[PDB]
Ligand binder design. Structure first.
Ligand SMILES: C/C(=N\NC(=N)N)c1ccc(NC(=O)Nc2ccc(/C(C)=N/NC(=N)N)cc2)cc1
Length: 280
């Protein structure tokens, strides 16, 4: 078939960047490059979540066309996916891990402050600003995300007729955001080590069983490279109990992230990006 005429009106379409599919396009008005995500026919709440969020490490929506398929126009991230930096047991300098992870933490912190849980954080959904190693990252893909109740309403009686399991669920309610911190844990583990914590590669233990026990695959030889501090943070994010797991605030306060050089590099990268006159 063809691209829709409203899209064609504003954009010249071009090569595939990835794949669900992402294409290169040029905005006609500006002659600048954009990315167009095509979702073959919830997207309208993803759009509405993305419209309202404003953070430098979260992807912005430029335009939207709901046609035969959906078309989401976004800023082009020249560095591609973090996934490509970590496949085939490739891995990043610990310093590069920290810079990227710091930014992931700020993004997810901002999400959680604003009542949004992402629910699908993985290396594919972390985009790099450039092909430089030191760059900005943005989190994308909010198609599984949730806005943070019926429980609160339920607890306004008088539980004369209320079922025990509802009363039991009160102990653990309101920690759904901790799933994001788990994922961040897994991504950090991968970035630091070049391999996955939980995997069916050369184990008899099921993936499910590995995850619910929290018994990640530790290969000391791969990790001898890595600081104890980095591994300590991983350990606090890969905690099975969601009430005990580190929050993004706790992670940002961890020794590993008290790194003024890393933080300066990030502030520098932001300035470069931003780049109107001000009173004084
Ligand atoms: C230019 C380029 N890579 N160059 C390179 N040398 N690797 C890019 C490759 C992939 C790439 N990926 C994306 O932009 N990926 C996205 C963007 C948005 C989304 C969204 C919003 N998805 N929503 C959804 N419901 N699925 C998903 C994936 C950007 C740039």
């Amino acid at each position: 078939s063809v691209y829709p005429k409203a899209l064609r009106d504003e954009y010249i379409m071009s090569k595939t960047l990835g794949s669900g599919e992402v294409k290169l396009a040029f905005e006609r008005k500006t002659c600048k490059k954009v990315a167009i995500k095509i979702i073959s026919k919830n997207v309208e709440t993803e759009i509405e979540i993305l419209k309202k969020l404003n953070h430098p490490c979260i992807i912005k929506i430029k335009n939207f066309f709901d046609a035969e398929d959906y078309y989401i126009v976004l800023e082009l991230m020249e560095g591609g996916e973090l996934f490509d930096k970590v496949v085939g047991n490739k891995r990043l300098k610990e310093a590069t891990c920290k810079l990227y992870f710091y930014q992931m933490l700020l993004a997810v912190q901002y999400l959680h402050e604003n009542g949004i849980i992402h629910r699908d954080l993985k290396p594919e959904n972390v985009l790099l600003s450039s092909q430089e190693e030191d760059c900005l990252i943005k989190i994308t893909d909010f198609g599984h995300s949730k806005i943070l109740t019926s429980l609160m309403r339920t607890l306004c009686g008088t539980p004369t007729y209320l079922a025990p399991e509802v009363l039991v669920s009160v102990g653990t309610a309101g920690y759904n955001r901790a799933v994001d911190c788990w994922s961040l844990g897994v991504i950090l583990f991968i970035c630091l080590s070049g391999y996955p914590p939980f995997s069916e590669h050369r184990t008899q233990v099921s993936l499910k069983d590995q995850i619910t026990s929290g018994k990640y695959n530790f290969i000391p030889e791969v990790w001898a490279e890595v600081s104890e501090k980095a591994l300590d943070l991983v350990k606090k994010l890969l905690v099975v109990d969601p009430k005990a797991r580190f929050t993004t605030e706790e992670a940002l306060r961890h020794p590993w992230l008290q790194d003024e050089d890393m933080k300066r590099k990030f502030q520098d990268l932001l300035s470069e990006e931003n780049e109107t006159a001000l009173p004084q």
